[PDB]
Amino acid sequence: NVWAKEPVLVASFAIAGLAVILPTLSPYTKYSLMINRATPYNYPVPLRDDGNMPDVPSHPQDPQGPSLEWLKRL
Amino acid sequence: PGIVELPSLEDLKVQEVKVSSSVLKAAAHHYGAQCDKPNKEFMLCRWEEKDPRRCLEEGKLVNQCALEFFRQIKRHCAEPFTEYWTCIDYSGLQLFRRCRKEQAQFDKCVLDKLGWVRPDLGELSKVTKVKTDRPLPENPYHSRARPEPNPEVEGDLKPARHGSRLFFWTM
Amino acid sequence: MMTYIVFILSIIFVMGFVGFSSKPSPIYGGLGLIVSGGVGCGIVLNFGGSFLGLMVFLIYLGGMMVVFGYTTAMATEQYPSNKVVLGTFITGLLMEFLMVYYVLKDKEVEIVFKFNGMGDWVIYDTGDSGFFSEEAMGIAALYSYGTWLVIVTGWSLLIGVVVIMEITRGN
Amino acid sequence: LLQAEKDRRVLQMLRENLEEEATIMKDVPGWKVGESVFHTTRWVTPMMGELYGLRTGEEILSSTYGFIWYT
Amino acid sequence: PFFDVQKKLGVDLDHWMTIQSAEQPHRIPARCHAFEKEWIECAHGIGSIRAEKECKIEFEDFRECLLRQKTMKRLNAIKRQRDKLIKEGKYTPPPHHSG
Amino acid sequence: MNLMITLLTNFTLATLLVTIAFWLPQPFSMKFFLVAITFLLFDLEIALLLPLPWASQTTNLNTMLTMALLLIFLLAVSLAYEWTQKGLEW
Amino acid sequence: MFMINVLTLIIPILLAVAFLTLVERKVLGYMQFRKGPNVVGPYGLLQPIADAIKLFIKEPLRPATSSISMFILAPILALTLALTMWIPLPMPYPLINMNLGVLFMLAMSSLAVYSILWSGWASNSKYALIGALRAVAQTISYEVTLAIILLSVLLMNGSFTLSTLIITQEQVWLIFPAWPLAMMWFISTLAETNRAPFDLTAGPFALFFMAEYANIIMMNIFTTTLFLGAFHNPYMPELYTINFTIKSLLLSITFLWIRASYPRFRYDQLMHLLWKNFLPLTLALCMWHVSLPILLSSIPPQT
Amino acid sequence: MNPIILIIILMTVMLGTIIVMISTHWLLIWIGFEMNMLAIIPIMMKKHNPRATEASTKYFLTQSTASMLLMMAIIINLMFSGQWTVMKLFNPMASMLMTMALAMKLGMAPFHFWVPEVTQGIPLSSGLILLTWQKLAPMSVLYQILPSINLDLILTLSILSITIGGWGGLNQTQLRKIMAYSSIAHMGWMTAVLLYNPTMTLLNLIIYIIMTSTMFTLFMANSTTTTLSLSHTWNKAPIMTILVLITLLSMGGLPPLSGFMPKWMIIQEMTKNDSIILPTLMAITALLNLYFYMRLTYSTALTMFPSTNNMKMKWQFPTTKRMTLLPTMTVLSTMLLPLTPILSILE
Amino acid sequence: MSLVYMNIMMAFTVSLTGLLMYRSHLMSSLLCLEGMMLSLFILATLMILNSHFTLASMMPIILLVFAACEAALGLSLLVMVSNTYGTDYVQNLNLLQC
Amino acid sequence: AKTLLHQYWDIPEGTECHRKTYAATSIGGASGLVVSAYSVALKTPTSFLEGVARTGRYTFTAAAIGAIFGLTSCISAQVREKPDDPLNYLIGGCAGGLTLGARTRSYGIGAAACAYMGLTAALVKMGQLEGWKVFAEPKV
Predict the structure, then answer these.
(1) Which of G213, G195, G202 is nearest to G121 (CA)?
(2) Which domains are delineated in chain I?
């Protein structure tokens, strides 16, 4: 109906509507936020030892803290 | 106002680890894995007490840990470490994907003869507890007390004493 | 080719501002403002200097004096030096060299300030690990935290569009 | 490692500059020898004219404006 | 009239832009961070007249942090006296890498 | 000052070219003005838009997506407004 | 060694432009049924050398201008832009590694708009002013669109550094994640260099001509760099230099070949065309290239 | 003009003034003043005479150099103790430049030359909205930035504003120039009490905005630009005459009438400070700025000028002009004497 | 004190006097207003670069874009003045007298 | 301006004479330069030499008014020898009014300026004598 008169307008509105709506439905924006968060620009500053913390491991080989393992599995 | 207290040159003379910088980058992961364990004490000393000329003895200690690490990596395997850092050296800004197979060769060398599994991603992260000897300080900003608090006016109000207390129209 | 080069470019900047504050023909004024903006770009790139002077170079020296010369072309003609313009240029150069001499061979010349007279290598960072050329991530933060600011900025520019079409005979 | 090297280097420049001040200004009246201008006795980072000052050209031009117009 | 819609609706639309020592995107400080923290905590809940005439010490300390006025004055006096004694010619200076 | 050295060499070699090229042989319309300020205001909104690839790396991405789409959508509103109100026609 | 780099970059541009004149004349000749220039020497190379030196010999028309210093000042600006504007474009290792160079590209194109306007003012009387004013308008009509498309095509690349571009175009060419955006970009490069199908209908015509054809070679070099390029092996970069020069040659031939066979546009048709056809579509491609990398979970590693 | 476009531009004027009010950042104050300018320019040139063209040109040049001098003062404020807080300034020079920029922006006797010229060649709706909002918006900023101002600045500007807004007005017979001179005089009054108790200044702002709304509403009710037209509107309607009487004398400020309360309370909280010769000089000039009101009254309602016919024709047709809100603002503008203790409604 | 600030403020005041006094054309006056604009741009930008005041670096680009659209409104007014007269002179404005 | 009014009132009254009249001439020259600056800013005298003539006329008239003002202040201080009564500056203001009428060459202008300047100069001495503040408390 309008596809014959101004076709570049209709194509622009279609791709604009998907560029607005399409970021809602996603299994990937959570991955976007995780990858964008997990990049250390600054130095990871240590902390004073004992406020009686049964967490936060001392050797960086110890997997007690939250590591990243979804990276190497894409 | 007051004089500064700057320390002596005879305390400010420790031999540096006078390596070049590209090889220092090329050996950095296993430098962070085995050594750099007592320098988080140094860095915590620095971030708590922001005074270089106060936490320099741990600077001497990280200097000797780095020098001992480089002695250990020099006298044993690898000599292919030399080929590895000159492989990573001349490729502009250093992408680690530039020289990967000789990184694997050096890793197999150190793994077979000495150990030191490579610190994985992202294990040079993950904010970390560490214990020290000296206790944490008070007032790291050398500052006076707060001068005068404001006495707050508190309590339920009585009604207005004689209206506006303007010229007239009382009540 | 020496240390006081930001100072020298500041002097050529004041030279340009005098050169079109002498009120010439407006195409000579636009030429002088392009020269002044180019050397101001040189100054702000010399203070390091990543993005902002290359940003003003597109806008004023990329799309504002173009429109000024465009409007000088369509509106005025200036169809064919004078003692007034040349006299103002000589008095401006007199003020320039007078201030430069009385600062350079003294401590300070003050309107109401205290201008320490030496080269402006002071003050600067002591070679810290900036790693992102601070202004870059600064203006990168203009979208995350900048909720209200870009909303009222875009709304002001949209209203500027409807203003221009109405005044130039809407619709 | 770089932080420790930088700390030792800037304390070295401070000690050198204050010894050179205490030699060179022994004739002017007044002139307390090494008093920081600030009131609060805290370590402040100097203004890069106290680290790279009185060096005459080479290292200061490669130091302050070296990276700014290096490439 | 300075209204308080900013505090009543609660959304801090502008308080991040306002001072230094806010949440920078990469957590880097400014040049005079600690001086600002001490001056702001000195003049926080104070009646802005005895705040004017009691925190003046740290205020002038912060001003000469931010502009480094007397520090450059002292450095210029050092270089002028150095210039007049090198014009005198005593001890051609080994402050440039030499002894 | 090394790209200033390149700038000086280009300018001096070009002046050598021009001086060898010269000393060896010896009303209006309103519709022009709409395009000018149209370019000006849209180029200013481009000046707003262009630091967007600096900004993609932050931990608050939903607001940046929303306000970036708001800025381009406003630019589209301005263009469609002058399009519907016979702004650039002949 | 730095001024030696300067000489090896800015001396061969004159040879490049004059041999481009013979290349485009021979290409148009074989698009037609023509040979020539081939009578003058072997295949006509000293014939562009000869007409360049003839036009330097041939006596100028005496001015008959106004503001002789401004008549000096415009073509010197055009040719010094054409000289200064090959610096960060990487033939394999570029001349100055910059933090940002593409905004510098667009700003220098805006300075070329200034040079066209100043030549049109300082040239002659009213009709030359009107024609050059419309030419400035149809040149300024596209630094909206080309800069917008540049922003969209390197939003997939994070940084302005252009060496991250020459890295991250290794796997597939960037012509594939944006074909219509690149095609509209190439139309805008025809508009920036101002050839047919975009109309035109004085002195020095040699320097005007020089600035235009160096602008053409510059825009096609930046076309080849911006969209494609094969793998770069260090300690043998002559491979990348050869492949770069070959694809820039092929796209310059395609550029002149698109000039060769189409009529010029009507001026109001050109403005109507640009605004009401390219500009909503460039905005739509911008917003879709904004909304895509948050959906592929791949923002570029902006160093 | 389109009504959608006009309602949107009114919304932008509202938005710019609220951004001037609420924002603790200096940049947003400057943006609010600028957006106020950019929106208020097409409120002028609502017709297409060259009168509005020259008027909006003069207004734009003075308005723009005021905005840029304000930005100069703010960048000097950050040259000194550097933060974007609306507070005490840190420079007599920056405060000096800021008060001069807000005096250019506001309307003040060394910088008042644009006001009668810009009000001569504009429709009355545009003049009403520019007078109300452009005398409203900088007063919030001055109310904020009072504690760091040299009083010589404000007081010389105030005294000179009251005496020049008085001495202009005796020779001008255009209604718009009379209202503009009255505006310069009242802004001098509202500037004078700023460093003493600004509750008086904002209450006087409320009163003067109500007065200006009543004045330009009573001149919207009849397309009049000269006093001869006011005599013809005496002939065609009698209630307009007594309202011109009461409202012009309320501009005059007599004690039974509401315009005396802004003068009187100012003299109260001015003479609890020990300056006395300055109140009596200001109030003698308040006696001065009443004569052009008085001859305006004598033209309209208390003498009877000869009238042209076709008012004979006009008597058939009703007075079917719409009024925005006339009677509420009228009796609020005249009968607000015995509500003296509504001073405390403000702070 | 960074002595460059002295010459930049001096150049600001020179641009301000050039904005105020002008005899022939309004275009040169608006262009010197643009120069004054650029002066404030440059001074604020040098301060924000020197002080490492890194978060609120919105100022140079936002002051730029806003005062540029101010200049756009000024160009529209000057085109209207040149429309309603033969020229755009400072004179021929002797209607609407004070 | 500030320094010359401060040095005017710092001299006692008192006979430390003709320093006071020199200060009064500086007062008159400054005020005449003020009025001449506004006049050349609002007239276009056409030509420039006519403008310099107008500035010289205004400055010399104001300097002469201040001069004869300070001179008869000094003479009243020498003759009456009472440092408190404002009748001396009443004489001073009427003398300044007669000099203004002489340098405009009229009668009623001089008489009205005699009255106004006499009352205002008497008020100046009187308010300095009791102590009436310059422009402000500015406190409460």
Answers:
(1) G202
(2) 1-86 (1.10.287.3510)
Instruction: Please give the distance of CA F23 from its chain centroid, rounded to a whole number.
Output: 37
R_g of chain G computed on alpha carbons:
20
- Quick check: D45 contacting G, CB < 8 Å? no
* Helix (H) and strand (E) counts in chain E: 4, 0
Contact C35, I20 (CB under 8 A): no
Any B CB within 8 A of G234 CB: yes
Using the beta-carbon criterion (under 8 Å), do E68 and D47 form an inter-chain contact? yes
Show me where the domains of chain F are located. 1-85
Domain ranges for chain G: 1-303
Smallest Cβ–Cβ distance between E45 and the set B141, B143, B150 belongs to B150
Q: In 10 A of CB J122, how many CB atoms?
A: 19
C-alpha to C-alpha distance for F85 and C164, rounded to whole angstroms: 13
Contact G284 A18 (CB under 8 A): no
Using CA coordinates, name the residue in chain E closest to A41. E26
* Kind of pairing between the strands at A47-48 and B129-130: parallel
- Integer angstrom CA distances of residue B65 from B74, B131, G275, H300: 14, 18, 66, 99
CATH architecture of the domain covering C2-168: Up-down Bundle (1.20)
CA–CA gap between residue G98 and residue G49 (Å, rounded): 36
- Type of residue found at A13: F
- Return the bridge partners of I25, or none: I89
User: How far is the alpha carbon of I34 from chain H, nearest alpha carbon, in Å?
Assistant: 10
Q: Which of B33, B123, B128 sits opposite A67 (nearest CB)?
A: B123
What is the DSSP secondary structure assignment for residue H340, as one 8-state letter?
A: G
Q: Are B164 and B158 in contact (CB under 8 A)?
A: no
G287:A20 CB<8 A: yes
C112 min Cα distance to partner chain H (Å): 8
DSSP E strands, chain B? 129-130
Residue J15 near residue J74 (C-beta atoms within 8 A): yes
Using a threshold of 3 CB pairs under 8 A, tell whether chains I and E touch: yes
Nearest to G216 by CA among G52, G19, G42: G19
Give me the count of residues in chain C.
Answer: 171
B92 CA: distance to closest CA in chain G (Å): 9
Q: CA D11: distance to chain centroid?
A: 9
Q: Which two tokens stand for residue H221?
A: 């009710």
DSSP assignments along H206-222, one per residue: HHHHHHHHHHHHHHHTT
Q: Judged by CB atoms within 8 Å, which residues 320-339 of H form the interface with B?
A: 338
**What are the angstrom distances between the C-alpha of E74 and each of C103, C116, E31?**
17, 10, 20
* Chain C, chain H: beta-carbon pairs less than 8 Å apart: 38
Does E have 3 or more CB contacts under 8 Å with J?
Answer: no
- Report the CATH architecture of F1-85: Up-down Bundle (1.20)
Sole residue written with tokens 């000289």: G83
Backbone dihedral region of D8: left (phi > 0), alpha (psi from -120 to 50 degrees) or beta? alpha
Residues 6+ apart with CB under 8 A from H15: C152, C155, H35
**CA distances (Å), origin H285, targets C35, D57, H184:** 53, 68, 13
Say whether F45 and C157 touch across the interface (CB within 8 A): yes
Q: Give residue limits of the domains in chain H.
A: 1-347
Looking up tokens 């920036």 gives: G192
Query: CA neighbours within 13 Å on the CB side: how many for H240?
Result: 22
* Closest CA–CA distance from residue D68 to any residue of chain C (Å): 5
CB B150 within 8 A of CB E45: yes
Which residue in chain B has the smallest CA separation from D17? B6
With CB atoms and an 8 Å threshold, state whether B166 touches H341: yes
End-to-end C-alpha distance for chain F, whole angstroms: 50
Six-digit token string for G238: 């002559």
Hey, is the C-beta of B166 within 8 angstroms of any chain H C-beta? yes
Q: In 3-state terms, what secondary structure has residue G216?
A: helix
